């Protein structure tokens, strides 16, 4: 009944002709499309010629469920050479995003309670809520300065600065000056470096270091120089907190990182590595989905009115207890999922398989890299009827996996959710969102999937 691994359809391409296409173009922005049009033509599953190494691409929840069953105790995903290389060039420890095996598990189990635990979310929501409120207040001061009582702008910059403000408050208890004021040079450098870092990640991750060493030597220089400015933003943050908590321990709550520092169940070097991943990791992955949502709401007036109505409904109880936003706003929680179904920030899930397994009735040999492709998964018309239609209700009832699964699933998930959830909450209770730009926004791959264009949004205060 079960078929040999080589019976599987092959991807048409080359690891070599794609090296060059990346070499030449300095990227791979259509990857998601190319992967999508390959599933169309070859079915739910195919192997890629890595030239000896085994990789499989899958698109079905059915197959995600099968993959989790084979999460060992130490679920592996592929070692991401350039990022790990920066850690070894500078002698820093690795964070949970880059660790595998026992070292992974040791870190993960000491990070869940304060980063992801719903107990934790209960402590940090009310802070997040403050930044979200400060954001709508700022917008509404400007809006009301205009005669038609509206502002039409690109929100991306201020959205990006929100996620920096909120993350930093959730994470360090530090309130930078960044909402309802101007980006700092430390902000724009950080955003710039993050973008450069992603860009170069693509240029380097598709060929071994032996090749890139001499194929793109200054692309490596670019990646490291980018990380340099990233690790300098983060270190500054941690040095601040480390020296505060050496002098006294607060009795109230003052952040995700503080809890870690106060408990000292991890070594300073371990805490350092993780805060870095949390500081760099909580910016672009939160801000794009959030942007994408504003846009789908802008282009679905009806879905927006439902959401606003349920946010005016919940309005008084939520300001009274921000910690309730999780349970009073299910329609909005759903919209998030709907946004991520369509615009999954992380394009792929991936597992280096510890055990033989069987997918779509093929033998899958041990040590095989299995990548799940979310763009296809959530656009699979057969599972999401009228997939091109933005419909939150879909989620009111393994089809939702944009944070991954099992022990490995995103450690910042509940922070990401809370930041998007609270911002939308406050925008909806104060503004109508509008655009004439009703045509789809072309997504684009540089390590994460992101809008290529930024639509012009109108915010009309009610």
Ligand X SMILES: N#Cc1ccc([C@H]2CCCc3cncn32)cc1
- CA-based nearest residue to 278, from 161, 159, 411: 411
Smallest distance, its own copies to C-beta of residue 395, A: 29
Continuous H helices in 173-314? 185-205, 209-215, 217-244, 256-263, 268-281, 284-298, 301-313
Site string for its own copies, 390-429 (x = CB under 8 A): ----------------------------------------
How far, in Å, are 99, 123, 409 from residue 324 at the CA level?
A: 34, 11, 24
- If one counts every other C-beta atom within 10 angstroms of the C-beta of residue 297, the result is 27
- Of the pair 63, 434, the CB lying nearest its own copies is at 434
Pairing of strands 369-373, 54-58: parallel
Distant-in-sequence, close-in-space partners of 313: CB < 8 Å, separation ≥ 6: none
- Of the pair 2, 462, the CB lying nearest its own copies is at 462
- Of the pair 241, 273, the CB lying nearest its own copies is at 241
Give the three-state DSSP class for 451. strand
Identify what 77 binds: ligand X, ligand HEM, its own copies, none; CB under 5 to 8 Å per kind: ligand HEM
Q: Report the site for ligand X in 346-375 (rule: CB under 6 A).
A: 346
- Of the pair 241, 411, the CB lying nearest its own copies is at 241
Binder of ligand HEM out of 193, 230, 241, 411 (CB under 6 A): 411
- If one counts every other C-beta atom within 10 angstroms of the C-beta of residue 264, the result is 11
Contact of 402 with 302, CB cutoff 8 Å: no
Count of residues in contact with its own copies, rule CB under 8 A: 32
Identify what 175 binds: ligand HEM, its own copies, ligand X, none; CB under 5 to 8 Å per kind: its own copies
Identify what 276 binds: its own copies, ligand HEM, ligand X, none; CB under 5 to 8 Å per kind: ligand X
Q: Which stretch binds ligand HEM (CB under 6 A): 136-144, 285-293, 354-362, 428-436?
A: 285-293
91: left (phi over 0), alpha (psi -120 to 50) or beta: left
Binder of ligand X out of 276, 334, 359, 372 (CB under 6 A): 276
- CA-based nearest residue to 374, from 410, 415, 407: 410
456 near its own copies, rule: CB under 8 A: yes
Cα gap 281→97, rounded to integer Å: 10
Gyration radius (Cα) of the chain, Å: 22
Smallest distance, ligand HEM to C-beta of residue 232, A: 19
Count of positions (residues) in the chain = 462
Identify what 242 binds: ligand HEM, ligand X, its own copies, none; CB under 5 to 8 Å per kind: its own copies
Q: Which stretch binds ligand HEM (CB under 6 A): 240-248, 282-290, 307-315, 359-367?
A: 282-290
Contact of 294 with 307, CB cutoff 8 Å: no
Binder of its own copies out of 24, 148, 218, 386 (CB under 8 A): 148
Smallest distance, ligand HEM to C-beta of residue 172, A: 12
Q: What are the residues facing 369 on neighbouring strands? A: 55, 352
- CA-based nearest residue to 451, from 279, 299, 283, 293: 293
Tell me if 410 is assigned to a ligand binding site: yes
Contact of 78 with 369, CB cutoff 8 Å: yes
Cα gap 145→308, rounded to integer Å: 23
Q: Report the site for its own copies in 358-377 (rule: CB under 8 A).
A: none
Site string for ligand HEM, 52-91 (x = CB under 6 A): -------------------------x--------------
219: left (phi over 0), alpha (psi -120 to 50) or beta: alpha
- Of the pair 143, 329, the CB lying nearest ligand HEM is at 329
174 near its own copies, rule: CB under 8 A: yes
Cα gap 14→429, rounded to integer Å: 51
- CA-based nearest residue to 290, from 247, 345, 239: 345
Identify what 349 binds: ligand X, ligand HEM, its own copies, none; CB under 5 to 8 Å per kind: ligand HEM
Smallest distance, its own copies to C-beta of residue 123, A: 11
Site string for ligand HEM, 317-356 (x = CB under 6 A): -----------------------x----xx--x-------
Binding site for ligand X (CB under 6 A): 97, 276-277, 280-281, 285, 346, 410, 412, 448
Site residues (vs its own copies, CB under 8 A): 127, 145-148, 150, 152, 169, 173-175, 239-244, 246-248, 250, 252-255, 258, 434-436, 456, 458, 460
Extract the annotated binding site for heme. Answer: 410
């Amino acid at each position: 009944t079960v078929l040999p691994f080589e019976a599987m359809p092959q991807h048409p391409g080359n690891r070599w002709l794609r090296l060059l296409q990346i070499w030449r173009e300095q990227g791979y922005e259509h990857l998601h499309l190319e992967m999508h049009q390959t599933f169309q033509e070859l079915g739910p599953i195919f192997r890629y010629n890595l030239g000896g190494p085994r990789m499989v691409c899958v698109m079905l929840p059915e197959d995600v469920e099968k993959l989790q069953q084979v999460d060992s105790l130490h679920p592996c995903r592929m070692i991401l050479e350039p990022w790990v290389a920066y850690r070894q060039h500078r002698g820093h420890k690795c964070g949970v995003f880059l660790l595998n095996g026992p070292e992974w598990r040791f870190n993960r189990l000491r990070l869940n309670p304060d980063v992801l635990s719903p107990k934790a979310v209960q402590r940090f929501l009310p802070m997040v809520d403050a930044v979200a409120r400060d954001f709508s207040q700022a917008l509404k001061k400007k809006v009301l300065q205009n005669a038609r009582g509206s502002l039409t702008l690109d929100v991306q910059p201020s959205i990006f600065h929100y996620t920096i403000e909120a993350s930093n408050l959730a994470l360090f208890g530090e309130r930078l000056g960044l909402v309802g004021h101007s980006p700092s040079s430390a902000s724009l450098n950080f955003l710039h470096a993050l973008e450069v870092m992603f860009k170069s990640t693509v240029q380097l991750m598709f060929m071994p270091r032996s090749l890139s060493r001499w194929i793109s030597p200054k692309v490596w220089k670019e990646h490291f120089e980018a990380w340099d400015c990233i690790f300098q933003y983060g270190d500054n943050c941690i040095q601040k907190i480390y020296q505060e908590l050496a002098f006294n321990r607060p009795q109230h709550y003052t952040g995700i990182v503080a809890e870690l520092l106060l408990k000292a169940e991890l070594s300073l070097e371990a805490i350092k590595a993780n805060s870095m991943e949390l500081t760099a990791g909580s910016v672009d992955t939160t801000a794009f989905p959030l942007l994408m949502t504003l846009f789908e709401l802008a282009r679905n007036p009806d879905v927006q009115q439902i959401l606003r109505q349920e946010s005016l409904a919940a309005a008084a109880s939520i300001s009274e207890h921000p910690q309730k936003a999780t349970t009073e706003l299910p329609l909005l929680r759903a919209a998030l999922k709907e946004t991520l179904r369509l615009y999954p920030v992380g394009l792929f899930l991936e597992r280096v398989v510890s055990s033989d397994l069987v997918l779509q009735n093929y033998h899958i040999p041990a040590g095989t890299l299995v990548q799940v492709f979310l763009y296809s998964l959530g656009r699979n018309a057969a599972l999401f009827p009228r997939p091109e239609r933005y419909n939150p209700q879909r989620w009111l009832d393994f089809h939702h996996v944009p944070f991954g699964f099992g022990m490995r699933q995103c450690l910042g998930r509940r922070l990401a959710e809370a930041e998007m959830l609270l911002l939308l909450h406050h925008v909806l209770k104060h503004f109508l969102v509008e655009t004439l730009t009703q045509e789809d926004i072309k997504m684009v791959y540089s390590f994460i999937l992101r809008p290529g264009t930024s639509p012009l949004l109108t915010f009309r205060a009610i």
